[PDB]
């Protein structure tokens, strides 16, 4: 078929690469209505990564980050939902303070000079977040990136969503909606089959399953899927006015945390390497079950939180960052589910055996920002007009390193051995 006539299933068009790829498709001139978003959840799906009050927009010298960097600047669905407050990436110690100058010299580097400032002593970093205590960041150096800020990322997510049902877009949601299956004819993808028995027929399927990718088609472990966490505490309107318009601040050695919402709530995140939840499953392409981080949904368990190791962290940084809040309690703690792969790339490409059925995953924990341009790349994919570094980048690659530890400082922990998140 020519373009007008090309139907497309986008599964996990409910999160974050599977919406913008449905954007992407109605504005490239694909008919709504042969489209069609597949999600266990209804848009913003309630287990998207995406599913945030917040993300940090930190895009570095990379294309793909710049270009989603303007749009977000530019593009009048996701302009509101972009928060151009800054960002302070904060140092402490020897070897984190040497990683910062050179992280500045690289940005120098390469041509964002305009856009960031080292700031030497903590006067120069109180001087752009005077909320911070002096006492608790003796010795902290920080980049302030003026061009940074934080995503409204639930809200972004949902405006795609709205947009979408207004062009004519189809959905299938719940049991009509959690894929299970390919249809394959002679080898090509011709549709999908979800849990309840619902059958959808279409040229073209892409996978945008986040870290349930692994768990629905076998991908020989090129992608390990891992929880990080979050928590929030509530300010009163006249602690959170204080805050008005904060930078992110952040701290590869404590987490982070965002200026509160619209009701005075802050959420603030630690750093580490994520939790994997490993158990026996069989995606669709496994001969038989293997051992392979299944993520624990929060959707679906909603009395769970997060482990006891995690409350700690996180309590750490709110008494590093906002030590008059120590006593507020922590609540609506979850966990936050992506994939990685062993480079941290993406994995965007066609499956090597099932004609027409698409990859789109392989986040690595860091696209929420990606958000505006995936799905333009995705469009290119099933057209044929990726760039070819992108396709070597984002390709088919199992055997090419250990996910489990990808490029982050440590193989994850398993939520087996990190007692206080279930309460079933
Ligand atoms: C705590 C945390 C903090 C983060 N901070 C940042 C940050 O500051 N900046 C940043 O850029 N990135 C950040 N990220 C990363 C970012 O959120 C992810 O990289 C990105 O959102 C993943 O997009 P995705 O589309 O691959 O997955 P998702 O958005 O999770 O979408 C996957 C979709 O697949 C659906 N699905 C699952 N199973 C099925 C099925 N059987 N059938 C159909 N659909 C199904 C899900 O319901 C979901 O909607 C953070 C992530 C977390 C968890």
Redesign the pocket.
Request: aromatic share 14%; net charge negative; glycine share 16%.
């Given at each position: 078929p020519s373009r007008a006539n090309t139907k497309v299933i986008v599964?996990?068009g409910?999160?974050?690469?599977?919406s913008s790829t449905a954007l992407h498709l109605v504005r490239s001139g694909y008919t709504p209505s042969n489209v069609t978003v597949?999600?266990?959840?209804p848009i913003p799906?309630s287990?998207?990564?995406?599913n945030?009050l917040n993300?940090?927009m930190?895009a570095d010298a990379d294309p793909a980050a710049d270009a989603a960097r303007q749009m977000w600047n530019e593009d009048e669905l996701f302009k509101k939902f972009f928060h151009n407050t800054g960002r302070l990436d904060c140092a402490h110690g020897e070897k984190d303070i040497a990683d910062l100058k050179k992280r500045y010299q690289n940005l120098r580097d390469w041509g964002l000079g305009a856009t960031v400032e080292w700031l030497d002593s903590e006067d120069e970093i109180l001087k752009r977040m005077p909320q911070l205590t002096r006492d608790q960041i003796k010795g902290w150096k920080a980049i302030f990136s003026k061009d940074g800020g934080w995503l409204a990322?639930a809200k972004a997510i949902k405006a795609i969503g709205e947009y979408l049902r207004d062009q004519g877009v189809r959905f299938g949601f719940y049991g009509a909606?959690?894929?299970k299956q390919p249809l394959l004819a002679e080898g090509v993808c011709i549709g999908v089959e979800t849990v309840d028995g619902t059958r959808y027929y279409a040229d073209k399927v892409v996978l945008?399953?986040?870290?349930?990718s692994p768990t629905?088609v076998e991908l020989q472990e090129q992608c390990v899927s891992k929880?990080?966490?979050?928590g929030h505490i509530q300010l009163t309107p006249e602690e959170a006015a204080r805050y008005k318009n904060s930078p992110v601040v952040y701290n590869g050695d404590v987490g982070f945390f965002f200026e509160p919402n619209e009701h005075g709530i802050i959420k603030v995140?630690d750093e580490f390497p994520g939790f994997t939840r490993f158990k026996m499953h069989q995606p669709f392409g496994a001969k038989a079950p293997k051992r392979i981080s299944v993520p624990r949904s929060h959707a679906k368990h909603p009395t769970d939180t997060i482990p006891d190791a995690s409350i700690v962290r996180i309590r750490r940084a709110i008494a590093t960052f906002m030590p008059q809040f120590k006593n507020k309690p922590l609540f609506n703690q979850a966990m936050?589910?992506?994939?990685d792969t062993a480079d941290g790339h993406l994995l965007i490409c066609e499956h090597p055996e099932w004609k027409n059925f698409y990859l789109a995953?392989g986040?690595?924990?860091?696209?929420?920002?990606?958000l505006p341009i995936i799905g333009k790349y995705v469009v290119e994919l099933l057209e044929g007009t990726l760039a070819d570094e992108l396709a070597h980048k984002w390709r088919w690659r199992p055997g090419s390193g250990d996910a489990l530890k990808s490029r982050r400082e440590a193989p994850a922990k398993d939520l087996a051995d990190m007692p206080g998140w279930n309460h079933d």
């Open positions: 599964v996990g409910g999160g974050t690469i599977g597949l999600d266990a959840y799906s287990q998207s990564a995406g945030d993300k940090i930190d990322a909606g959690s894929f945008a399953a986040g870290a349930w629905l929880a990080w966490v979050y995140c936050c589910w992506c994939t995953t986040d690595s924990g860091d696209s929420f920002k990606l």
